[PDB]
Coordinates of C-alpha atoms and ligand atoms in Angstrom, one line a residue:
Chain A
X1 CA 1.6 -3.4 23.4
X2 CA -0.4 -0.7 21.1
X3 CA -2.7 -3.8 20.5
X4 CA -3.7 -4.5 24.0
X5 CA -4.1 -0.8 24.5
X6 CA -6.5 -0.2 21.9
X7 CA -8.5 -3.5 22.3
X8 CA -10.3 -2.2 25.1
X9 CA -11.8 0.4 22.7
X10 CA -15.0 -2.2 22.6
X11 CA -16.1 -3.9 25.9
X12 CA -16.7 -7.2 25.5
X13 CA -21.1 -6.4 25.4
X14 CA -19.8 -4.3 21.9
X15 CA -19.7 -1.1 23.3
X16 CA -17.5 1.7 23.5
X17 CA -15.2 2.2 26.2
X18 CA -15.4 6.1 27.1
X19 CA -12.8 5.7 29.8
X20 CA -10.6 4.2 27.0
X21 CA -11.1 6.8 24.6
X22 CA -10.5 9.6 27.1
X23 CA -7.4 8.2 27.8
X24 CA -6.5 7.8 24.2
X25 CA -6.5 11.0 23.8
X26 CA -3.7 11.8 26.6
X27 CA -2.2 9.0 25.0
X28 CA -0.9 9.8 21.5
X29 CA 1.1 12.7 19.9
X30 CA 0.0 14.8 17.4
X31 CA -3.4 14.8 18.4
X32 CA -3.3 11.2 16.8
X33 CA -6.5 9.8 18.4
X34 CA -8.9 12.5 17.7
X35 CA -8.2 12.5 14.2
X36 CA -8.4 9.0 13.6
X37 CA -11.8 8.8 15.4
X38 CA -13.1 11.4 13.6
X39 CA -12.5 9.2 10.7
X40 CA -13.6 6.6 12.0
X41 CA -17.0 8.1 13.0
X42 CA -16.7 10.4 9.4
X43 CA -18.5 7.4 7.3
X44 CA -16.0 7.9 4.8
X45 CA -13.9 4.3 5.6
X46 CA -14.3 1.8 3.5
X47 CA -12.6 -1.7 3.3
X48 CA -13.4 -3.1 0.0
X49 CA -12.5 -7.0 -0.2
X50 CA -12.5 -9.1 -3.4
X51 CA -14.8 -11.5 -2.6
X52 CA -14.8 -13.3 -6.2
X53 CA -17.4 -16.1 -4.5
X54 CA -19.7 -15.2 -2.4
X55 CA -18.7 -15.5 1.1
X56 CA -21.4 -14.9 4.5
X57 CA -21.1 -11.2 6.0
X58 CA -19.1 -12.8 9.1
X59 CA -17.1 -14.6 7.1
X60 CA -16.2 -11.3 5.3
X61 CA -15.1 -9.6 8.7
X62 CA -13.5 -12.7 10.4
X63 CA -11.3 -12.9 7.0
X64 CA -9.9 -9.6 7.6
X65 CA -8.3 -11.2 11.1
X66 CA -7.7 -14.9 10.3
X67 CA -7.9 -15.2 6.8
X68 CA -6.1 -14.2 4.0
X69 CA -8.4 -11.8 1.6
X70 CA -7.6 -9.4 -0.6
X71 CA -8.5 -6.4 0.4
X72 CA -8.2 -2.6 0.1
X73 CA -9.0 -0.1 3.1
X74 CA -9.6 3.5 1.4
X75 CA -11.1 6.6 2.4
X76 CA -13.1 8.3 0.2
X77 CA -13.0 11.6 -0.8
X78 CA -14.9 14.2 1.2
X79 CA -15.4 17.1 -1.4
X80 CA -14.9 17.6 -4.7
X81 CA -11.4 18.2 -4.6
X82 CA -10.3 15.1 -3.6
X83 CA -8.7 11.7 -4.3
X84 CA -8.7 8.8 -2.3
X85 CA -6.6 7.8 0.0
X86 CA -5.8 3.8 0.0
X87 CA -3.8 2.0 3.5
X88 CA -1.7 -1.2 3.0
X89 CA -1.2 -2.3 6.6
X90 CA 0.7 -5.1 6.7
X91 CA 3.8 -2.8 4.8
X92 CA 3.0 0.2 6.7
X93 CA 1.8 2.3 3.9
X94 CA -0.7 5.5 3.2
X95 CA -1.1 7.8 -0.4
X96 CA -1.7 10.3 2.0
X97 CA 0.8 13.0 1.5
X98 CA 1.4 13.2 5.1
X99 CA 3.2 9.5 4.7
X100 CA 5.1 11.0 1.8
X101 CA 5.9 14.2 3.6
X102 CA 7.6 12.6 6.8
X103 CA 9.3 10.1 4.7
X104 CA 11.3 12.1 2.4
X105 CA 13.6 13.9 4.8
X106 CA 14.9 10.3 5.5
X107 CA 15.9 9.8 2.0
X108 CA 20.0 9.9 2.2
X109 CA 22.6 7.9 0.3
X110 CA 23.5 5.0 2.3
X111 CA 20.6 4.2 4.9
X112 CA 17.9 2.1 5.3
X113 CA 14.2 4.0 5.4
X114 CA 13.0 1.2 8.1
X115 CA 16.1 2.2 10.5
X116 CA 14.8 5.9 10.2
X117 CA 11.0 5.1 11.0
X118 CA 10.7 1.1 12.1
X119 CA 11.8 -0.4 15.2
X120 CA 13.1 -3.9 16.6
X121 CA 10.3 -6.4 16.8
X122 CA 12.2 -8.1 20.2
X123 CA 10.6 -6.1 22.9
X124 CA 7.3 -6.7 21.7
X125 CA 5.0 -9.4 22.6
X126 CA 3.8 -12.1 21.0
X127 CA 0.0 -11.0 20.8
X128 CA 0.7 -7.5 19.3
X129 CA -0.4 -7.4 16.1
X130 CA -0.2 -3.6 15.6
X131 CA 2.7 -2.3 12.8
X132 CA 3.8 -5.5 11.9
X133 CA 5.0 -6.0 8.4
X134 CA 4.8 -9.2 6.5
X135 CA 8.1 -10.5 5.1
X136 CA 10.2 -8.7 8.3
X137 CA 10.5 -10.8 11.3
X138 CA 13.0 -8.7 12.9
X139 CA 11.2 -5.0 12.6
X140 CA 8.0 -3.6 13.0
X141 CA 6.5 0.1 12.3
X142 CA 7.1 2.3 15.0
X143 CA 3.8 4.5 15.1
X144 CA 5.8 7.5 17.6
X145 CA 8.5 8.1 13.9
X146 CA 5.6 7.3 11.6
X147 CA 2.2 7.2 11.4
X148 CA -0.7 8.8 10.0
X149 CA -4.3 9.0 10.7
X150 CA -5.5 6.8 7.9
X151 CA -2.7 4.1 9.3
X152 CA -4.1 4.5 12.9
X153 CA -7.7 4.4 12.1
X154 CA -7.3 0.9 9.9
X155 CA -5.0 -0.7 12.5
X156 CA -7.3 0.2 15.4
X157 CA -9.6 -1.8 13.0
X158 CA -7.8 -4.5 11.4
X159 CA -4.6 -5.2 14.8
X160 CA -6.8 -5.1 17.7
X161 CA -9.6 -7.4 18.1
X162 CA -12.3 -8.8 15.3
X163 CA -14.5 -6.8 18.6
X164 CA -13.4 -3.8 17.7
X165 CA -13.7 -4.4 13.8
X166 CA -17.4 -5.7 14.2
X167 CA -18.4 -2.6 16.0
X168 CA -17.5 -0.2 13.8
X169 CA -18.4 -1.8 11.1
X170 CA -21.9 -3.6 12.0
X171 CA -25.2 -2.6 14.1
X172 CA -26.9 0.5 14.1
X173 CA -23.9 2.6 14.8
X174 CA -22.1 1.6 11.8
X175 CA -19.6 4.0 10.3
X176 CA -17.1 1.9 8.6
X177 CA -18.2 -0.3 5.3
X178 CA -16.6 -3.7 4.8
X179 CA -18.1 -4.7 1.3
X180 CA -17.1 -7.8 -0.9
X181 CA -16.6 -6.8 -4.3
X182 CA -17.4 -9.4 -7.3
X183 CA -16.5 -8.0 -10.3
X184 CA -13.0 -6.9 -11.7
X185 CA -14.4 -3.7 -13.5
X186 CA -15.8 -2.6 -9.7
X187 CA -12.3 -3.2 -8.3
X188 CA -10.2 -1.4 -10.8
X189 CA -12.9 1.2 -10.8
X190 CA -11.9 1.6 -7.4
X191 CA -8.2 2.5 -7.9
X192 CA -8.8 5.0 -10.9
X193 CA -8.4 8.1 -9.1
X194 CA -6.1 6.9 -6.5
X195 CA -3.0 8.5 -8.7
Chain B
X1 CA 24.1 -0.9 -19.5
X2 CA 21.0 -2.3 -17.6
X3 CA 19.3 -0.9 -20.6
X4 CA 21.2 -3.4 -22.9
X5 CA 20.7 -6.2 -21.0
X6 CA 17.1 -5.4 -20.6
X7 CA 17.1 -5.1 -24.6
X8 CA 18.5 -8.3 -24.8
X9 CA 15.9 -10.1 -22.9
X10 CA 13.4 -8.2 -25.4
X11 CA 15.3 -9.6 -28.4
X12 CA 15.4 -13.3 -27.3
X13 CA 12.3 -13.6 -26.4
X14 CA 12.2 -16.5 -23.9
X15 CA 11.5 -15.6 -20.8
X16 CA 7.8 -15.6 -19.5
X17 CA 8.6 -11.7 -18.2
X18 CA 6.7 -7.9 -18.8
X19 CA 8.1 -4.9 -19.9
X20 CA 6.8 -1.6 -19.0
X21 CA 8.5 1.5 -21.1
X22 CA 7.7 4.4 -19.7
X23 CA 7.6 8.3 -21.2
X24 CA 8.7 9.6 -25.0
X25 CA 12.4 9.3 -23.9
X26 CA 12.3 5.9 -22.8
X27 CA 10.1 4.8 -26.1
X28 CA 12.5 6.4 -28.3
X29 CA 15.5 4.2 -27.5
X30 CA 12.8 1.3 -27.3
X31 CA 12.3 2.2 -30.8
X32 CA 15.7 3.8 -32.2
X33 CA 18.0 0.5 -31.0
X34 CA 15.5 -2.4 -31.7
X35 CA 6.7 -14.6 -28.2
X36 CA 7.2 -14.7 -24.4
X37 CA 7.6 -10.9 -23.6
X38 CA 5.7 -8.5 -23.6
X39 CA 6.0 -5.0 -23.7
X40 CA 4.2 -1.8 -23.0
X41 CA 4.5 1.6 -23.3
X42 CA 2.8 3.8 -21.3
X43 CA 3.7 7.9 -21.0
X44 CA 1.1 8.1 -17.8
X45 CA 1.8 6.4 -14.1
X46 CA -1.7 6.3 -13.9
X47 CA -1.7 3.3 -16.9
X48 CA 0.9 1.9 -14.6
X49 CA -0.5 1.7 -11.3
X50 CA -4.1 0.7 -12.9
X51 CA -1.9 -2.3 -14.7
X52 CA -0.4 -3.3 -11.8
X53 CA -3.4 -3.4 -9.6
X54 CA -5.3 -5.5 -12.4
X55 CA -2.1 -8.3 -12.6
X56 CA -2.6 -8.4 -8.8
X57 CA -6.1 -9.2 -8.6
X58 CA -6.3 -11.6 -12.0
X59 CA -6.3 -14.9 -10.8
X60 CA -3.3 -16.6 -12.6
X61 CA 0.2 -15.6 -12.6
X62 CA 0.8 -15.0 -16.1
X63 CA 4.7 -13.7 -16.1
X64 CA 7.7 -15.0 -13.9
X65 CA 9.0 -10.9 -14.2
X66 CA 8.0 -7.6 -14.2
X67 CA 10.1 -5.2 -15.3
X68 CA 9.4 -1.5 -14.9
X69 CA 12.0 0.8 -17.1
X70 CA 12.0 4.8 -17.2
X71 CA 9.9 5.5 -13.8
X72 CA 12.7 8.5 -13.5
X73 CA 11.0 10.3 -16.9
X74 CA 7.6 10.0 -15.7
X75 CA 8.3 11.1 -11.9
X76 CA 10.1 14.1 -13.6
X77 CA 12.7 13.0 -11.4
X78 CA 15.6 16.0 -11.6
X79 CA 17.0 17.5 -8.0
X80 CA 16.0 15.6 -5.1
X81 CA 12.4 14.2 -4.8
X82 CA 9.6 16.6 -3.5
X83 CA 6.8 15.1 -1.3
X84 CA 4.7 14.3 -4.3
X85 CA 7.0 12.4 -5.8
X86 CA 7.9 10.3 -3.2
X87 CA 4.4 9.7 -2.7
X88 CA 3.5 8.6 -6.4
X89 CA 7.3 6.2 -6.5
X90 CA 5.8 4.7 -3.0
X91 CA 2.8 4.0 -4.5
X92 CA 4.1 2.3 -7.8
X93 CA 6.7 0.4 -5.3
X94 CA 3.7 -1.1 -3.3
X95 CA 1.9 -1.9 -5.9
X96 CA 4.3 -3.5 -7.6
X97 CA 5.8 -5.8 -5.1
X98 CA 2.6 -6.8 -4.2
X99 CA 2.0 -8.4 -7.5
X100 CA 5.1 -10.2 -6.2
X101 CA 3.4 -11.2 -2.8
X102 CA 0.3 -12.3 -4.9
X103 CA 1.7 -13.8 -8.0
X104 CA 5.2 -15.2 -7.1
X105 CA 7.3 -12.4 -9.6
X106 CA 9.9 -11.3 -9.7
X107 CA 10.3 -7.1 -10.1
X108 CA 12.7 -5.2 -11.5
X109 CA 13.3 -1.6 -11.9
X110 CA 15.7 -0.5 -14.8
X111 CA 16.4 3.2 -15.1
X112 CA 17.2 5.1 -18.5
X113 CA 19.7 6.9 -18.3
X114 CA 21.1 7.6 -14.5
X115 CA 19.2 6.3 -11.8
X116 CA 18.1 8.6 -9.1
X117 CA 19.6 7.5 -5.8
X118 CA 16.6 8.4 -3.6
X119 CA 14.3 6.6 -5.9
X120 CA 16.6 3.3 -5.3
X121 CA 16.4 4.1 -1.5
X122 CA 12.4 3.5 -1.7
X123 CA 12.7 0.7 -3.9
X124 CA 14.9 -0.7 -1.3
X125 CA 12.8 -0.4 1.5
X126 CA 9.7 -2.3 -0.2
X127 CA 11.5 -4.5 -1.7
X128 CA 12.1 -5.6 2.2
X129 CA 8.7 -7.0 2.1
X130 CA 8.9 -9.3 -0.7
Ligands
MG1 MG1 -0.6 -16.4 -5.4
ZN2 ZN1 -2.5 8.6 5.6

């Protein structure tokens, strides 16, 4: 579903689909598309993996879609008045104050927040990796009741196809930083502005 | 009541579990109605999200629990929640659960005082993913 879709982003010689993207933008509400690829063309993404051992560059990237790494997309600030924003994927989560924002009007006694902004996982297919949550077979994120730009630009990244993450990320026309992080004062330095 | 019971796991002592007291209020009953537990007091969310992050990425599980008592006080939790504190409770949620998805823990939250019922709606819906 939005993962097939988005795949062809990146043709399979690594480059970038301009039929696709025009489309995209016909595509998705709220002008959704255009402001995720502006970040993702802004340099300011960055997916910051613990990488205790050294691990190869590929490695690093092919982790983010088979493996199990620990790792933490951000954006980083673009002035000086500015915190960063951080993106848990796999529980559908942003800082952003957007995220925040469309949340809290769903906040009554007596309901679940997922019935309010997820949606069954049955219709989907089996090769659609895009909004779903670990833990919850039975629901996935439903990007039309919620979803950001920060959300949108990682899951093009990390729910489509290690294609589309490579292209972004390596080359000459990179604009998106994957970096392994070896030391435990650079990771917490990472979070300290974050609140 | 959950504030007793949470005072009687401090007192015995046994369990391999984490206390985090949050705000003046919260410390004062610490203090005014009082080794495998620890506990913590911190009057800043920032201490708590940087301590939570740093228990996810250490290596070894060190506690089966976590417990996280007076996030109320420091969200100045009074009325309904504004946008900004829903976003600073969502990110304390997160965070905390996934020391759960790293580590194995168990997480609880324990309110002084009365809890506030949207707060317990996001710590339901996080909770989902443990
Ligand atoms: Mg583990
Ligand atoms: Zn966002």
């Amino acid at each position: 579903n939005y993962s097939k879709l988005l795949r062809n982003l990146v043709t399979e010689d690594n480059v970038l689909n301009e039929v696709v993207v025009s489309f995209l933008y016909q595509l998705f509400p709220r002008d959704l598309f255009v402001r995720a690829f502006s970040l993702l063309e802004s340099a300011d993404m960055f997916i910051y993996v613990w990488m205790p051992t050294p691990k190869e560059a590929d490695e690093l990237l092919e982790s983010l879609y088979n493996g199990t790494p620990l790792y933490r997309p951000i954006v980083r600030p673009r002035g000086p008045d500015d915190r960063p924003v951080c993106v848990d994927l796999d529980h559908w989560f942003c800082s952003c104050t957007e995220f925040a924002a469309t949340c809290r009007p769903h906040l009554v006694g007596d309901t679940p927040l997922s019935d309010a902004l997820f949606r069954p996982t049955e219709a989907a297919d089996p090769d659609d990796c895009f909004g779903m949550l670990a833990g919850l077979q039975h629901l996935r994120a439903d990007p039309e009741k919620l979803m950001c730009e920060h959300l949108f630009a990682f899951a093009i990244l990390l729910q489509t196809d290690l294609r589309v993450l490579r292209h972004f990320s390596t080359g000459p026309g990179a604009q998106v930083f994957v970096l392994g992080i070896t030391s435990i004062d650079e990771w917490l330095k990472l979070h300290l502005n974050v609140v | 009541n959950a504030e007793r019971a949470l005072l009687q796991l401090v007192v015995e002592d046994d369990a391999k579990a984490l206390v985090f007291v949050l705000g003046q209020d919260a410390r004062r009953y610490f203090e005014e109605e009082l080794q495998n537990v620890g506990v913590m007091f911190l009057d800043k969310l920032q201490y708590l999200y940087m301590y939570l992050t740093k228990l996810e990425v250490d290596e070894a599980p060190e506690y089966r629990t976590l417990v996280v008592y007076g996030l109320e006080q420091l969200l100045g939790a009074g009325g309904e929640l504004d946008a900004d504190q829903v976003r600073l409770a969502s990110l304390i949620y997160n965070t905390a659960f996934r020391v759960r998805v790293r580590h194995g823990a168990a997480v609880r939250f324990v309110a002084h005082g009365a809890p506030h019922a949207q707060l317990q709606q996001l710590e339901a819906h996080w909770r989902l993913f443990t």
